[PDB]
Enzyme design. Structure first.
Site, PDB file in Angstrom:
ATOM      1  N   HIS A  19       4.650  -4.924   3.208  1.00  0.00           N
ATOM      2  CA  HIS A  19       3.555  -5.359   4.131  1.00  0.00           C
ATOM      3  C   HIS A  19       2.678  -6.476   3.578  1.00  0.00           C
ATOM      4  O   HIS A  19       2.917  -6.986   2.451  1.00  0.00           O
ATOM      5  CB  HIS A  19       2.739  -4.180   4.775  1.00  0.00           C
ATOM      6  N   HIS A  57      -0.574  -6.940   2.621  1.00  0.00           N
ATOM      7  CA  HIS A  57      -1.726  -6.842   1.732  1.00  0.00           C
ATOM      8  C   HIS A  57      -1.367  -7.338   0.329  1.00  0.00           C
ATOM      9  O   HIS A  57      -0.193  -7.484  -0.003  1.00  0.00           O
ATOM     10  CB  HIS A  57      -2.189  -5.396   1.657  1.00  0.00           C
ATOM     11  N   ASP A  93      -1.452  -5.892  -2.630  1.00  0.00           N
ATOM     12  CA  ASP A  93      -0.627  -5.021  -3.477  1.00  0.00           C
ATOM     13  C   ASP A  93       0.885  -5.128  -3.186  1.00  0.00           C
ATOM     14  O   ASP A  93       1.708  -4.345  -3.740  1.00  0.00           O
ATOM     15  CB  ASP A  93      -1.112  -3.562  -3.537  1.00  0.00           C
ATOM     16  N   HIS A 134      -0.125   2.648   8.219  1.00  0.00           N
ATOM     17  CA  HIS A 134      -1.069   2.037   7.302  1.00  0.00           C
ATOM     18  C   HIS A 134      -1.370   0.599   7.755  1.00  0.00           C
ATOM     19  O   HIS A 134      -2.512   0.136   7.724  1.00  0.00           O
ATOM     20  CB  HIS A 134      -0.479   2.038   5.851  1.00  0.00           C
ATOM     21  N   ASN A 147      -7.191   3.027   2.434  1.00  0.00           N
ATOM     22  CA  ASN A 147      -7.816   1.922   3.154  1.00  0.00           C
ATOM     23  C   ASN A 147      -7.288   1.910   4.583  1.00  0.00           C
ATOM     24  O   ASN A 147      -6.111   1.601   4.809  1.00  0.00           O
ATOM     25  CB  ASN A 147      -7.491   0.606   2.450  1.00  0.00           C
TER      26      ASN A 147
HETATM   27 ZN   LIG Z   1      -1.951  -2.063   2.409  1.00  0.00          ZN
HETATM   28 ZN   LIG Z   2      -1.780  -0.145  -0.922  1.00  0.00          ZN
END
Ligand SMILES: [Zn+2]
Ligand SMILES: [Zn+2]
Length: 230
Positions: A83, A85, A87, A148, A179
Site C-alpha cells: 500500500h 504509506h 512503511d 486499513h 492508524n
Molecule cells: Zn498504512
Molecule cells: Zn503500517
C-alpha cells in the site's frame, strides 16, 4: 526469538527466517509520538530475491539491502509495495538506485503520488476489484477489498503456506485498530473474511507490525476492528 523494537537500534534491520527461502525483515521508526516496529517479506525467486515492502524510510531500506547481501547473498531484483504509506513505499528511491525494479497496483501509485510519498515505477495489472488475484513469481498477490487502506494488498507464498497480511492484519498484542486515518472501517470486516475464505490452508500469518501468528490473527483483527466501531 522474533526481533522486537527494544532489540533494534535506530536505523538498523533484522532478518527472521520464516520457512525455507522465506524471511521477514524488521526495522523501527518514529511515528505519531512513539517508536514502531514494522515487517516486510523476502522470498527466494529462483536465483534472485523478491522483496515485499520497504523497511520504512531511506536509511532503513539501505540497511535492509546490506543485511540481505550479508546474510543471503542473492540479488534483490524486484520489490512490491502492498500500500501507499511510508512503511511500504518509503525507501523506493533507494531500491531503484540499487537496480531494484519496483511495483505496485495503479491504485497505490495514484494514492502515493497524491500524498507526496515515493512512487513505485511499475503498475501491477489484475488487482483492481475485490477478490482479484495474480501470480508474481514465487507469490500470489491478492486484493481483498478496502480495510486499513483502500489499496491494501496481501501476499501468499504457496510453497510455504505463508500469508503476509500487511497493515490490514493486526498482531495479537495490538488492542486498537492502528492508524485509521485512511481506513475503511465499514468494509474492513468483509475484506478480512474474504482473506480467511481464500487462504484456509495458511500456516504462518504475518501482520504489518509486530509478531507473527497463525490464522487467529485474522479473527483477532476482525474483533479489534469491531471494538473500535463504538
Ligand atoms: Zn498504512
Ligand atoms: Zn503500517
Amino acid at each position: 526469538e522474533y526481533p522486537t523494537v527494544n532489540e533494534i537500534p535506530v536505523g538498523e534491520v533484522r532478518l527472521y527466517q520464516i520457512a525455507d527461502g522465506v524471511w521477514s525483515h524488521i526495522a523501527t521508526q518514529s511515528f505519531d509520538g512513539a517508536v514502531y516496529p514494522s515487517n516486510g517479506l523476502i522470498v527466494r525467486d529462483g536465483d534472485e530475491l523478491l522483496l515485499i515492502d520497504t523497511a520504512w524510510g531511506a536509511k532503513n531500506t539501505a540497511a535492509l539491502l546490506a543485511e540481505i547481501e550479508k546474510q543471503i547473498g542473492l540479488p534483490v531484483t524486484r520489490a512490491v509495495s502492498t500500500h501507499f504509506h511510508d512503511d511500504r513505499v518509503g525507501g523506493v528511491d533507494v531500491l531503484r538506485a540499487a537496480g531494484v525494479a519496483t511495483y505496485a497496483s495503479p491504485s497505490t501509485r495514484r494514492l502515493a503520488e497524491a500524498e507526496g510519498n515515493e512512487i513505485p515505477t511499475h503498475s501491477l495489472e489484475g488487482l483492481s476489484s475485490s477478490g482479484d488475484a495474480v501470480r508474481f513469481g514465487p507469490v500470489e498477490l491478492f486484493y481483498p477489498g478496502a480495510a486499513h487502506s483502500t489499496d491494501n494488498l496481501v501476499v501468499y507464498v504457496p510453497s510455504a503456506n505463508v500469508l503476509y497480511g500487511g497493515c490490514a492484519v493486526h498482531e495479537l498484542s495490538r488492542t486498537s485498530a492502528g492508524n485509521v486515518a485512511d481506513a475503511d472501517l465499514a468494509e474492513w470486516p468483509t475484506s478480512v473474511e474474504r482473506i480467511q475464505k481464500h487462504y484456509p490452508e495458511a500456516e504462518v500469518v504475518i501482520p504489518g507490525h509486530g509478531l507473527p501468528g497463525g490464522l487467529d490473527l485474522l479473527q483477532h483483527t476482525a474483533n479489534v476492528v469491531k471494538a473500535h466501531k463504538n
